[PDB]
C-alpha cells in the first residue's frame, strides 16, 4: 500500500541518538514530494539525489533512521562530519545517497526540570564506522586500572543525558531527526513513487 512515513515521522516517542532506530521500508508506494511539500522541517538536505526526482525513482530498500539530538548537532548528520555525534553516535558514509530531515521538537521532548530520557555517547575509544550502532553501556576505562563495572575515578558512564529544558537556547533545544537511506542492489526495486 502507501509507504509508512507517518509511522516514522509522527511517532509519539523517538530514540536516543546512541541507539538510533532503523525502519526498513519495502514493497510500497512512497510520495517523496508530499514529504518535501510539508512546511515544517528546518532541514531537508539531499545527497546524491533530488527531493522531486526522488518521486520518479525506484529503490531496492529504503531505511528510516530516527533519533533526537540538539540543533547545533544537526550539522553532524551529513557525510564527512566530525563531533561527538558523527564520531560516537551516528556516522553517515561519504558516498551517502539519501536525505536528512530535521525539525524542532522542543514542544514534545523538553520537560520543565529537564528531559533525562534522551541520551548520547560521550566516551568511545575510536570513531564509529558508517551506519554502526553501539549500544554498549560498559563502564569506560580512561586510565590503566580496570573498571570491573564500577563507575569511579577514570571509570566513566559512557552515555550522558541531554537534559533538555524548555528554557534552553534554540541551538541547544531538542530536534527530531529522520535519515532516509536509499538502497539500490541487483535485486528488484520494491520502493517507488509513480511506477
Amino acid at each position: 500500500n502507501l509507504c509508512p512515513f507517518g509511522e516514522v515521522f509522527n511517532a509519539t516517542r523517538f530514540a536516543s541518538v546512541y541507539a538510533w532506530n532503523r525502519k526498513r521500508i519495502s514493497n510500497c508506494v512512497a510520495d517523496y514530494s508530499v514529504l518535501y511539500n510539508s512546511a515544517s522541517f528546518s532541514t531537508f538536505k539531499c545527497y546524491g539525489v533530488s527531493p522531486t526526482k526522488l518521486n520518479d525513482l525506484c529503490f531496492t530498500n529504503v531505511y528510516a533512521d530516527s533519533f533526537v539530538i540538539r540543533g547545533d548537532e544537526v550539522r553532524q548528520i551529513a557525510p564527512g562530519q566530525t563531533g561527538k555525534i558523527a564520531d560516537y553516535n551516528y556516522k553517515l558514509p561519504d558516498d551517502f545517497t539519501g536525505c536528512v530531515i530535521a525539525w524542532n521538537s522542543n514542544n514534545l521532548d523538553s520537560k520543565v526540570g529537564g528531559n533525562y530520557n534522551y541520551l548520547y555517547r560521550l566516551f568511545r575509544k575510536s570513531n564509529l564506522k558508517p551506519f554502526e550502532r553501539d549500544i554498549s553501556t560498559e563502564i569506560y576505562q580512561a586510565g590503566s586500572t580496570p573498571c570491573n563495572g564500577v563507575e569511579g575515578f577514570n571509570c566513566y558512564f559512557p552515555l550522558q543525558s541531554y537534559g533538555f529544558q524548555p528554557t534552553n537556547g534554540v541551538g541547544y533545544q531538542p530536534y527530531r531527526v529522520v535519515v532516509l537511506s536509499f538502497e539500490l542492489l541487483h535485486a528488484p526495486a520494491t520502493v517507488c513513487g509513480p511506477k
Partner: antibody
Amino acid sequence: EVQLVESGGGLIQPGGSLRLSCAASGFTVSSNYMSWVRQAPGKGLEWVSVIYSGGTTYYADSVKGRFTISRDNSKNTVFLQMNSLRAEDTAVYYCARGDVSGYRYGLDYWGQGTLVTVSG
Amino acid sequence: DIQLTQSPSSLSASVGDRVTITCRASQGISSYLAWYQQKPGKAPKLLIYAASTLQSGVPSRFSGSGSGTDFTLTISSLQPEDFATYYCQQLNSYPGTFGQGTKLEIKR
C-alpha cells in the same frame, strides 16, 4: 597520583614557531579529551584547543590554522604546535583533561602551566 | 554566541562569612557550567561541575546552584585559604567561554 607536566615554553620572536608538550601520568591520554587553555598575563582564561579519544580536533577561532594539537600514545604526551605566533599569543599555556562542549565534567586535572612569551 | 556575565568583579569578606558569586548566561545552557578556583601562580582547580555537583576532594563548604541562565557559587563559611579568583565556565558549546573572574579578598 595524576600529574600533567608541560614543557616547551619560553621566548619566541613574532612569527616564530613553538612546540609545547604535556606529559601525563595517572590516566591514558589516548582514551581522553585533552584540552589546552591559555591565560594572558594578568587576564582571564581562554580555551585554545581539544583532541578527542577518536582523533577529532577542534580549535578556538583565534588560533585556527596556526595551532595544531597532536599526541604520542606510547609517550602519553599531548603536543600543541604553535606556528606564526603573534604578541597576542603571549600567555601561560595549560593542558587539562576534559572538553568544553557538551562535557559536563569540565577540566579536572590541569598542568602547572608554561609561559610562552612572544617578543622581539 | 554565549555571553557569561560573572559578578561581582571583586569582593572582600570576613572569615566565617557566607560568600555568593553569580554567573549569568546569555542563552539557556541547562546545567553545563563549572566553577574554578585559581590561587596565585597556580593552575585553576575545578570546584563544582554540572552546575551543582561538587568535585572529589573539594570541601563541603563549597556549593553550586542554578540551571538555565542564572548560576551561583556559595562558600558557606569562608576560610583564610579561600582567597583566590573564582571563574565560572560554560560547558555547553565551544569555545567553552569562562567568566571574567571574581577576586575574593579575606577581610582581616
